[PDB]
């Protein structure tokens, strides 16, 4: 059941309606293709009502299960909408040929629970303060069911 964990920061500036996500690192990632190499990268999606609104991606790290990224991404989300959105973070194994397999995902924001809700609520309660937290990756099938319209 151990897919890995991902650390990212969240920051929200209500006046400008700027939501910043910094992908910091991932650890203990599942090795997807046994025998070969693990080349992880991270995708970030901004979602609302089951729709992917914006998609961003990190660089690809080669031959590691414990990649460091330190890559920042910003989204424009007005303060009247911030409580309705979801930020979805997926770690995938890059392959030059074939669909890239997801290792796992997590989401924060509307309809999140547990530690993910706590991270989002901390961000909202502290305008302009970046907040970093570790999250356990979950299998995509379960996260997708929760995100679907």
PDB file of C-alpha atoms in Angstrom:
ATOM      1  CA  UNK A   1       0.000   0.000   0.000  1.00  0.00           C
ATOM      2  CA  UNK A   2       3.160   2.165   0.107  1.00  0.00           C
ATOM      3  CA  UNK A   3       3.184   4.336  -3.026  1.00  0.00           C
ATOM      4  CA  UNK A   4       5.331   7.138  -1.638  1.00  0.00           C
ATOM      5  CA  UNK A   5       4.880  10.575  -0.194  1.00  0.00           C
ATOM      6  CA  UNK A   6       5.073  14.076  -1.590  1.00  0.00           C
ATOM      7  CA  UNK A   7       5.952  17.374   0.068  1.00  0.00           C
ATOM      8  CA  UNK A   8       4.590  20.636  -1.259  1.00  0.00           C
ATOM      9  CA  UNK A   9       3.849  24.127  -0.051  1.00  0.00           C
ATOM     10  CA  UNK A  10       0.691  26.140  -0.507  1.00  0.00           C
ATOM     11  CA  UNK A  11       0.324  29.922  -0.325  1.00  0.00           C
ATOM     12  CA  UNK A  12      -2.739  32.050  -1.024  1.00  0.00           C
ATOM     13  CA  UNK A  13      -2.867  35.830  -1.495  1.00  0.00           C
ATOM     14  CA  UNK A  14      -6.556  36.883  -1.413  1.00  0.00           C
ATOM     15  CA  UNK A  15      -6.251  40.429  -2.764  1.00  0.00           C
ATOM     16  CA  UNK A  16      -4.421  39.354  -5.924  1.00  0.00           C
ATOM     17  CA  UNK A  17      -6.151  35.988  -5.970  1.00  0.00           C
ATOM     18  CA  UNK A  18      -2.827  34.182  -6.385  1.00  0.00           C
ATOM     19  CA  UNK A  19      -2.466  30.539  -5.358  1.00  0.00           C
ATOM     20  CA  UNK A  20       1.120  29.276  -5.364  1.00  0.00           C
ATOM     21  CA  UNK A  21       2.094  25.605  -5.148  1.00  0.00           C
ATOM     22  CA  UNK A  22       5.758  24.647  -4.686  1.00  0.00           C
ATOM     23  CA  UNK A  23       6.560  20.991  -5.342  1.00  0.00           C
ATOM     24  CA  UNK A  24       9.446  20.297  -2.987  1.00  0.00           C
ATOM     25  CA  UNK A  25      10.281  16.595  -2.996  1.00  0.00           C
ATOM     26  CA  UNK A  26       8.882  13.102  -3.042  1.00  0.00           C
ATOM     27  CA  UNK A  27      10.112  10.076  -1.143  1.00  0.00           C
ATOM     28  CA  UNK A  28       9.775   6.317  -0.976  1.00  0.00           C
ATOM     29  CA  UNK A  29       8.163   6.159  -4.395  1.00  0.00           C
ATOM     30  CA  UNK A  30       6.936   2.848  -5.722  1.00  0.00           C
ATOM     31  CA  UNK A  31       9.154   1.489  -8.486  1.00  0.00           C
ATOM     32  CA  UNK A  32       6.691   1.020 -11.333  1.00  0.00           C
ATOM     33  CA  UNK A  33       8.570  -0.913 -14.019  1.00  0.00           C
ATOM     34  CA  UNK A  34      10.547  -3.535 -12.076  1.00  0.00           C
ATOM     35  CA  UNK A  35      13.964  -4.127 -13.553  1.00  0.00           C
ATOM     36  CA  UNK A  36      14.170  -0.733 -15.288  1.00  0.00           C
ATOM     37  CA  UNK A  37      14.635   2.879 -14.222  1.00  0.00           C
ATOM     38  CA  UNK A  38      12.351   5.217 -12.258  1.00  0.00           C
ATOM     39  CA  UNK A  39      12.037   8.703 -13.804  1.00  0.00           C
ATOM     40  CA  UNK A  40       9.457  10.608 -11.768  1.00  0.00           C
ATOM     41  CA  UNK A  41       7.812  13.924 -12.477  1.00  0.00           C
ATOM     42  CA  UNK A  42       4.860  15.697 -10.938  1.00  0.00           C
ATOM     43  CA  UNK A  43       1.719  17.094 -12.535  1.00  0.00           C
ATOM     44  CA  UNK A  44      -0.454  19.716 -10.853  1.00  0.00           C
ATOM     45  CA  UNK A  45      -4.036  20.290 -11.958  1.00  0.00           C
ATOM     46  CA  UNK A  46      -6.415  23.023 -10.838  1.00  0.00           C
ATOM     47  CA  UNK A  47      -9.921  21.556 -10.839  1.00  0.00           C
ATOM     48  CA  UNK A  48     -13.470  22.655 -10.206  1.00  0.00           C
ATOM     49  CA  UNK A  49     -16.684  20.660 -10.550  1.00  0.00           C
ATOM     50  CA  UNK A  50     -14.850  17.728 -12.127  1.00  0.00           C
ATOM     51  CA  UNK A  51     -13.199  19.874 -14.820  1.00  0.00           C
ATOM     52  CA  UNK A  52      -9.431  20.295 -15.280  1.00  0.00           C
ATOM     53  CA  UNK A  53      -8.991  24.066 -15.595  1.00  0.00           C
ATOM     54  CA  UNK A  54      -5.152  24.416 -15.663  1.00  0.00           C
ATOM     55  CA  UNK A  55      -2.332  21.827 -15.921  1.00  0.00           C
ATOM     56  CA  UNK A  56       1.347  22.332 -14.949  1.00  0.00           C
ATOM     57  CA  UNK A  57       4.243  19.852 -14.781  1.00  0.00           C
ATOM     58  CA  UNK A  58       7.682  19.696 -13.202  1.00  0.00           C
ATOM     59  CA  UNK A  59      10.880  18.578 -14.882  1.00  0.00           C
ATOM     60  CA  UNK A  60      11.681  14.860 -14.965  1.00  0.00           C
ATOM     61  CA  UNK A  61      14.200  13.449 -12.497  1.00  0.00           C
ATOM     62  CA  UNK A  62      16.065  10.391 -13.712  1.00  0.00           C
ATOM     63  CA  UNK A  63      16.784   7.163 -11.845  1.00  0.00           C
ATOM     64  CA  UNK A  64      15.451   8.087  -8.427  1.00  0.00           C
ATOM     65  CA  UNK A  65      12.726   7.094  -5.968  1.00  0.00           C
ATOM     66  CA  UNK A  66      13.407  10.190  -3.827  1.00  0.00           C
ATOM     67  CA  UNK A  67      13.395  13.153  -6.219  1.00  0.00           C
ATOM     68  CA  UNK A  68      13.849  16.782  -5.239  1.00  0.00           C
ATOM     69  CA  UNK A  69      12.164  19.395  -7.438  1.00  0.00           C
ATOM     70  CA  UNK A  70      11.783  22.761  -5.710  1.00  0.00           C
ATOM     71  CA  UNK A  71       9.613  24.061  -8.538  1.00  0.00           C
ATOM     72  CA  UNK A  72       6.995  26.768  -8.095  1.00  0.00           C
ATOM     73  CA  UNK A  73       3.698  27.168  -9.924  1.00  0.00           C
ATOM     74  CA  UNK A  74       1.065  29.852  -9.567  1.00  0.00           C
ATOM     75  CA  UNK A  75      -2.630  29.942 -10.384  1.00  0.00           C
ATOM     76  CA  UNK A  76      -5.105  32.813 -10.531  1.00  0.00           C
ATOM     77  CA  UNK A  77      -8.036  32.020  -8.243  1.00  0.00           C
ATOM     78  CA  UNK A  78     -10.219  34.925  -7.056  1.00  0.00           C
ATOM     79  CA  UNK A  79     -10.978  35.052  -3.348  1.00  0.00           C
ATOM     80  CA  UNK A  80     -14.706  34.388  -3.979  1.00  0.00           C
ATOM     81  CA  UNK A  81     -13.716  31.118  -5.716  1.00  0.00           C
ATOM     82  CA  UNK A  82     -10.821  29.779  -3.634  1.00  0.00           C
ATOM     83  CA  UNK A  83     -13.067  27.706  -1.392  1.00  0.00           C
ATOM     84  CA  UNK A  84     -14.499  25.870  -4.440  1.00  0.00           C
ATOM     85  CA  UNK A  85     -11.360  24.653  -6.179  1.00  0.00           C
ATOM     86  CA  UNK A  86      -9.191  21.583  -5.900  1.00  0.00           C
ATOM     87  CA  UNK A  87      -5.456  21.310  -6.475  1.00  0.00           C
ATOM     88  CA  UNK A  88      -4.528  17.800  -7.658  1.00  0.00           C
ATOM     89  CA  UNK A  89      -0.939  16.578  -7.395  1.00  0.00           C
ATOM     90  CA  UNK A  90       0.081  13.430  -9.259  1.00  0.00           C
ATOM     91  CA  UNK A  91       3.457  11.694  -9.407  1.00  0.00           C
ATOM     92  CA  UNK A  92       4.152   9.810 -12.611  1.00  0.00           C
ATOM     93  CA  UNK A  93       6.936   7.700 -14.101  1.00  0.00           C
ATOM     94  CA  UNK A  94       8.128   9.129 -17.393  1.00  0.00           C
ATOM     95  CA  UNK A  95       8.493   6.720 -20.362  1.00  0.00           C
ATOM     96  CA  UNK A  96       9.483   7.958 -23.855  1.00  0.00           C
ATOM     97  CA  UNK A  97       7.002   5.533 -25.436  1.00  0.00           C
ATOM     98  CA  UNK A  98       3.620   4.680 -23.977  1.00  0.00           C
ATOM     99  CA  UNK A  99       1.298   6.453 -21.578  1.00  0.00           C
ATOM    100  CA  UNK A 100       3.105   7.521 -18.411  1.00  0.00           C
ATOM    101  CA  UNK A 101       1.955   5.465 -15.416  1.00  0.00           C
ATOM    102  CA  UNK A 102       0.828   7.338 -12.330  1.00  0.00           C
ATOM    103  CA  UNK A 103       2.448   6.268  -9.091  1.00  0.00           C
ATOM    104  CA  UNK A 104      -0.172   8.044  -6.991  1.00  0.00           C
ATOM    105  CA  UNK A 105      -2.038  11.303  -6.392  1.00  0.00           C
ATOM    106  CA  UNK A 106      -3.355  13.536  -3.692  1.00  0.00           C
ATOM    107  CA  UNK A 107      -5.687  16.494  -3.732  1.00  0.00           C
ATOM    108  CA  UNK A 108      -6.264  19.476  -1.496  1.00  0.00           C
ATOM    109  CA  UNK A 109      -9.165  21.903  -1.447  1.00  0.00           C
ATOM    110  CA  UNK A 110     -12.914  21.494  -1.731  1.00  0.00           C
ATOM    111  CA  UNK A 111     -14.065  18.027  -0.639  1.00  0.00           C
ATOM    112  CA  UNK A 112     -10.643  17.116   0.757  1.00  0.00           C
ATOM    113  CA  UNK A 113     -10.279  15.344   4.074  1.00  0.00           C
ATOM    114  CA  UNK A 114      -7.784  14.488   6.725  1.00  0.00           C
ATOM    115  CA  UNK A 115      -4.310  15.944   6.451  1.00  0.00           C
ATOM    116  CA  UNK A 116      -5.153  17.387   3.020  1.00  0.00           C
ATOM    117  CA  UNK A 117      -8.023  19.442   4.375  1.00  0.00           C
ATOM    118  CA  UNK A 118      -5.826  20.554   7.273  1.00  0.00           C
ATOM    119  CA  UNK A 119      -3.162  21.826   4.853  1.00  0.00           C
ATOM    120  CA  UNK A 120      -5.729  23.717   2.800  1.00  0.00           C
ATOM    121  CA  UNK A 121      -7.437  25.178   5.873  1.00  0.00           C
ATOM    122  CA  UNK A 122      -4.020  26.322   7.224  1.00  0.00           C
ATOM    123  CA  UNK A 123      -3.331  28.060   3.917  1.00  0.00           C
ATOM    124  CA  UNK A 124      -6.673  29.891   3.985  1.00  0.00           C
ATOM    125  CA  UNK A 125      -6.384  30.915   7.622  1.00  0.00           C
ATOM    126  CA  UNK A 126      -2.965  32.520   7.012  1.00  0.00           C
ATOM    127  CA  UNK A 127      -3.066  34.787   3.949  1.00  0.00           C
ATOM    128  CA  UNK A 128       0.365  35.190   2.313  1.00  0.00           C
ATOM    129  CA  UNK A 129       2.033  32.552   4.537  1.00  0.00           C
ATOM    130  CA  UNK A 130       3.542  29.547   2.719  1.00  0.00           C
ATOM    131  CA  UNK A 131       2.727  26.256   4.426  1.00  0.00           C
ATOM    132  CA  UNK A 132       4.649  23.042   3.628  1.00  0.00           C
ATOM    133  CA  UNK A 133       3.415  19.564   4.480  1.00  0.00           C
ATOM    134  CA  UNK A 134       3.983  15.938   3.570  1.00  0.00           C
ATOM    135  CA  UNK A 135       1.141  13.931   2.076  1.00  0.00           C
ATOM    136  CA  UNK A 136       0.781  10.212   1.427  1.00  0.00           C
ATOM    137  CA  UNK A 137       0.184   9.333  -2.213  1.00  0.00           C
ATOM    138  CA  UNK A 138      -3.040   7.441  -2.942  1.00  0.00           C
ATOM    139  CA  UNK A 139      -3.959   5.188  -5.855  1.00  0.00           C
ATOM    140  CA  UNK A 140      -5.350   7.145  -8.783  1.00  0.00           C
ATOM    141  CA  UNK A 141      -8.580   5.115  -9.036  1.00  0.00           C
ATOM    142  CA  UNK A 142      -9.738   6.294  -5.622  1.00  0.00           C
ATOM    143  CA  UNK A 143      -8.708   9.917  -6.029  1.00  0.00           C
ATOM    144  CA  UNK A 144     -10.296  10.089  -9.474  1.00  0.00           C
ATOM    145  CA  UNK A 145     -13.613   8.768  -8.146  1.00  0.00           C
ATOM    146  CA  UNK A 146     -13.614  11.543  -5.526  1.00  0.00           C
ATOM    147  CA  UNK A 147     -12.778  14.238  -8.083  1.00  0.00           C
ATOM    148  CA  UNK A 148     -15.331  13.149 -10.694  1.00  0.00           C
ATOM    149  CA  UNK A 149     -18.420  15.276 -11.290  1.00  0.00           C
TER     150      UNK A 149
END
